[PDB]
Amino acid sequence: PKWERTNLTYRIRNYTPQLSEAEVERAIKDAFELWSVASPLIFTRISQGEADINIAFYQRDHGDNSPFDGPNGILAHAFQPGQGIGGDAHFDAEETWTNTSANYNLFLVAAHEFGHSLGLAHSSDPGALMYPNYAFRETSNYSLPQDDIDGIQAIYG
Ligand SMILES: [Ca+2]
Ligand SMILES: [Ca+2]
Ligand SMILES: [Zn+2]
Ligand SMILES: [Zn+2]
Predict the structure, then answer these.
(1) Which of 54, 72, 107, 151 is the 20 to 30 A CA-CA neighbour of 33?
(2) CA 157, CA 153: separation in Å to the nearest integer?
């Protein structure tokens, strides 16, 4: 399952109060760019309207049948490429979201979710961004690990 288009739109529907709106937007923009520099995909932000990828912070039951679980545990989930709910990413509004080394770092988690929104599943490689469990890595000048590059390149090009 892959996107049949290269320029995709995204919309941040709501925010987490833990960070400024500028910080949430920055975390998201930077997360999309990591995949962009390794594939033919281009991401355009819209403020209202129907975007391909909807992004939102939700708590527990939130209408899609996969409830979140409060602090820790499940951090976020994302739908595979598709119309409607397809490609959308939900973040557990009950987590502590940061832009530091403290758990958790929104940019790293968003980056992981977007891999899913683009059609990638988990990697068994512990150094991959797509590894199932969260681990902090310096974000300052972060680049996609080689395993993940192999991943989107195998899907798109
Ligand atoms: Ca949780
Ligand atoms: Ca969608
Ligand atoms: Zn959800
Ligand atoms: Zn995942």
Answers:
(1) 72
(2) 4
Please report the resolution in angstroms. Answer: 1.8
C-beta atoms surrounding 125 within 10 Å: 15
Q: What's the DSSP call for residue 80?
A: P
Question: Which overall architecture, per CATH, does domain 1-157 show?
Answer: 3-Layer(aba) Sandwich (3.40)
Å from CA of 77 to ligand 3 middle: 6
Cα of 79 to ligand 3 centre, how many Å? 8
Which residues sit opposite 117 in a β-bridge?
A: none
* 113 annotated active-site: yes
Q: What is the DSSP letter of 79?
A: P
Residues within 5 A (CB) of ion ligand 3: 64, 90
DSSP reduced 3-state for 151: helix
**Could you tell me the residue ranges of all domains in the chain?**
1-157
How far apart CA 11 and CA 7 sit, in angstroms, is 14
Rg (alpha carbons) of the chain, rounded to whole number: 14
Place of tokens 């992004």: 55
Q: Structure solved using which method? A: X-ray
Number of alpha carbons in the 13 Å side-chain half-sphere of residue 97: 25
Q: Looking at 21, 23, 113, 138, which residue is catalytic?
A: 113
